[PDB]
Structure formats: structure tokens, C-alpha cells
Paper text:
Glutathione transferases (GSTs; EC 2.5.1.18) constitute a large superfamily of multifunctional enzymes that are involved in phase II of xenobiotic detoxification by catalyzing the conjugation of glutathione (GSH) to a variety of electrophilic compounds. Most of the GSTs are dimeric proteins, each monomer harbouring two domains : a thioredoxin N-terminal domain containing the conserved GSH binding site (G site) and a more variable C-terminal α-helical domain (H site) usually involved in the binding of the GSH acceptor compound.
The structure of PcGSTFuA3 was solved at high resolution (2.1 Å) from crystals having the P6122 space group with one polypeptide chain in the asymmetric unit. Structural superpositions of apo/holo PcGSTFuA1, PcGSTFuA2 and PcGSTFuA3 unambiguously showed that PcGSTFuA2 and PcGSTFuA3 are in the holo conformation in the conditions used. In PcGSTFuA3, three formate ions mimic the binding of the two GSH carboxylate groups and of the GSH thiolate group. A fourth formate molecule occupies the position of the sulphate ion in PcGSTFuA1. The distance plot, which compares holo PcGSTFuA1 and PcGSTFuA3, revealed a significant difference in the β1-α1 loop. It is linked to the low sequence identity between PcGSTFuA1 and PcGSTFuA3 in this region and to a one-residue shorter loop in PcGSTFuA3. The β1-α1 loop in PcGSTFuA3 is longer than that of almost all GSTs and reduces the solvent accessibility of the H-site as observed for β1-α1 loop in PcGSTFuA1. The V-shaped PcGSTFuA3 dimer is roughly 5° smaller than that observed in PcGSTFuA1. In the active site, Ser-22 (PcGSTFuA1 numbering), which catalyses the GSH addition on ITC in PcGSTFuA1, is present in PcGSTFuA2 but absent in PcGSTFuA3.
Author numbering:
A (entry chain A), B (entry chain A): 2 to 251
């Protein structure tokens, strides 16, 4: 008797790529993993601010000029009238509001999980960004394309085509090497999940970076094939754990 | 009836500064916190390789030339004949070998703790290094001084006196800002320990960086006073939790 949660995500111009975002995938992973009923409302980049304002979703940050900056994912929960932005806030909301669903925040782990993503962001998200950003622009619909190109380039001071070198693959490998040695501190048979034998939001956050690569580059691309080869296939084994949680409603 | 564990540490030319090292303090904190009986064997920098070889302590890493590099802390446990190097390995050894002592590795936390120190090292250890490295050289005894200067400078390609600028305090503040926001994910009243209401090795690792600053710079220095002021005194409150675990046997 629960009404579907409305989940706001950014579409693409090809069905296989409809769900592509690294941050929106954090929320889709949580929704899927927790087994909550939802529907995706697909929102183009330049329409994000408008939709947020229209539903009372807060902005998640300020621009360099101090002006409000609105981002997805956002969810609207008809069952409680909650409207929540930012994937971390959304995860904790769902944990708290649907306590019967599978837990992603075991006690005493919230700082550790937060710190983990602070390590992953610069060392894994940033290299993957450089690797895929041109192909991201390519998979977006036209109104989204102009907004995306204009924003990212203004920030990067560089044409999108001029980003994405071999230095990025080196940096990615090094960041993953540190995550690999962290996982290994759990000991053999426990070294594919941060807590060894259960999934946390932090694991899904890492997976979100990986699936962003796979969807942007293409599951059959040389780039994805190269990723699956890193560290004797460890991240292939990592991602295989989350295959059942990748449903997209298109 | 337990015999004291022998703990190898690097001395200084002033009693207040005898225990100064960021890594050796990780082991001293663990020994103190766990309430284990120990004695410090004080070993000068150039004598570390010799002492290690003499007691069967392994090297913890290789130099750029691939040659073995021996470091302290090391412990020798007469009760089991164990000789263990590297502060992480030493902590886990003590956890495992003395299970009745206060726990520092709760289940499911080993990867999270490892990842946390990977975040702290570049963002907190490295800025503090730049800040104190000249005063570190200053507090060492003469044979240690030459070794320390020669090694660090060969690595830094810069005289020790030319290191330590305002950029370092900015970088330190930014690294601590990220750790601060991680701790705050635990919620109010739980935001001074990574797990909120218990101490882990990861907390002691952060404390080791802080006490290194305090001992190197001096508890009364402007630099230590400045550290205690950062973030409305949060790190002062953090360090106050570990005051009872700072016994030094000099």
C-alpha cells in the first residue's frame, strides 16, 4: 500500500545510458538494494533548478559566486511528504524512514563511511571524471548538452575534448591500489566489502563511480575492458556483487 | 608475571621531547591504552638498521633504489619471542596476542580504519611534517641529526630551513576540516571519536600526528597554541581524551 517514491535523475539520448550519473546512481543503488518502490522523473540539466524550486528541494551547495546551486539526485516521498536532496542525505533518510529495509549504516560506522568517500572522491571519482567527461556530454540530450559543456568547461578552463589522458588511468590505478590495500586489512575472504560480510552505503558509493564508468564508456568498450583488468580483476569481482541492484525503470 | 615488552623508539636531546615520533607514538599510545608493561630501548636514527638486524626485526619498506629500509617503531615481546615492526602490524599484534586488553579493532572496522589513515596521511601528516621538520632536526641528538638532515633533504631536494610556510597551515586546516565533517556524521555528542563512543586504533593514529606537533613545537609554543585554536578548539577537545595515555618512561 506504499506509494512509489519519486526519484529525480538525468536522462540520456540512448536507453542503455538513461541512468548514468555517479551521484544519482548512489540513490538508485540504495533504492534497489533496499527494495523500495520508486519511479524515475527524468530531468534535464538546465531544468534541475526549476524542478527543485517547484517541489521544495533545497540546493546542495553554492557556486563560486555564492549563488545557490541545485543538483540531483533528489527524491520526493509521497508517503511522508519528505523532499530530500544530496545522495548522502537521501541514503540516511531512507535508512531512518524505512527501518525495516536492509541496513546501510551499521552503528559506529557513519564517520568511517564519510571518511572513506572523502578518500575515494579525489582518488577515484576525479580520474574517472577526466576519463569519461567527453563521452558524458555525448550521451546527454541537446538542452542538457549545452548546459553541461558550458558549466564543466567554465570550471575546467579547457575544452572537454582536451581532457582525458593516460595520467588519469595512472591516477585511477593508484587510488584503487589504496582502496585495495584497505579492503585487504579485513583478511582473505572478507576483502571485497568494506565491512567484510555486509554492504554499507560506502560500498555502494564506490560502485556508483564504477557503474558511471561502465555506462558512460560502454560495457563493451576498451576502457571498460581495461577497468575489469585492473588488479587481477578485483573490481570486476567487486562490481559483480551489485549486479542485482542495477534495475533501471526505462 | 608478564615480562615488559621492549619498545624501540628514537630519543631526543631533551627529556620533554624524548618521545616525539608520529609513528612511534602510535605504538606508545597503544601500549599505554592497553595497559601493557613495557620498557623503551632508545635507538638513534643511524643505528636503527643495525638494531633491527640484530633482533630479527624486518624492514618495513624499500628505498627508491630497492634497498631495504628499516624503521621504528619495533617491539620485542619476551613473553612470546615475537619481534614486530610497523605501527599498524604492532597494534594488530597486541590486539591479537593480548585479547584481554582494551580492544582497538572492533569487528568490521579494519578496512575503514585503514582507509581513514590513508585519508589522514596526505592531509594531516604531510602538512605537520612541513611545519615541524626543522624543529625535529633540532631536537635530535647529533648522530641522529646528520642522518635525519641528510635523508630528509635528499628526499625533499631542499634545505630543511626552507620548508614550512603558511601554505602548510592552510593545507592542515583543510585536511582537518574533512576529518571534522566526517566525525560530525556521527551526530552531536558522538563527534570526537571515529566510532562515537569508543576508541579505535584509527583515533590513536590521528592523536599521534597531533602529539608529534605538540612535542616538536612545544606545548607552550605559538604553533601549538594556534593548533588548539583551529575549529573552535575541536582538536584540543579531541586530544584531551588521550591525556591519560601519554606516559613516557624517561
Amino acid at each position: 500500500s506504499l506509494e512509489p517514491i519519486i526519484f529525480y535523475d538525468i536522462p540520456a539520448n540512448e536507453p542503455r545510458q538513461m541512468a548514468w550519473g555517479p551521484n544519482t546512481w548512489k540513490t538508485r543503488y540504495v533504492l534497489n538494494f533496499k527494495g523500495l518502490k520508486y519511479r524515475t522523473e527524468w530531468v534535464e540539466y538546465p531544468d534541475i533548478e526549476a524542478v527543485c524550486k517547484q517541489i521544495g528541494a533545497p540546493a546542495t551547495e553554492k557556486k563560486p559566486d555564492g549563488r545557490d546551486h541545485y543538483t540531483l539526485p533528489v527524491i520526493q516521498d509521497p508517503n511522508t511528504k519528505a523532499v530530500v536532496a544530496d545522495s548522502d542525505a537521501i541514503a540516511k533518510y531512507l535508512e531512518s524512514t524505512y527501518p525495516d529495509t536492509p541496513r546501510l549504516f551499521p552503528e559506529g560506522t557513519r564517520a568511517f563511511q564519510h571518511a572513506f568517500y572523502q578518500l575515494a572522491r579525489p582518488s577515484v571519482l576525479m580520474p574517472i571524471f577526466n576519463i569519461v567527461v567527453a563521452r558524458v556530454w555525448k550521451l546527454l540530450r541537446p538542452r542538457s548538452q549545452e548546459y553541461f559543456r558550458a558549466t564543466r568547461e567554465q570550471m575546467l578552463g579547457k575544452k572537454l575534448e582536451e581532457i582525458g589522458s593516460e595520467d588519469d588511468w595512472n591516477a585511477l590505478e593508484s587510488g584503487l591500489a589504496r582502496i585495495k590495500s584497505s579492503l585487504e586489512a579485513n583478511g582473505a575472504g572478507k576483502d571485497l566489502l568494506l565491512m567484510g560480510d555486509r554492504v554499507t552505503f560506502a560500498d555502494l558509493q564506490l560502485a556508483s563511480l564504477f557503474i558511471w564508468l561502465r555506462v558512460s564508456a560502454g560495457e563493451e568498450s576498451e576502457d571498460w575492458k581495461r577497468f575489469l583488468s585492473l588488479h587481477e580483476g578485483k573490481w570486476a569481482k567487486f562490481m559483480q556483487q551489485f549486479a542485482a541492484y542495477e534495475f533501471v525503470d526505462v
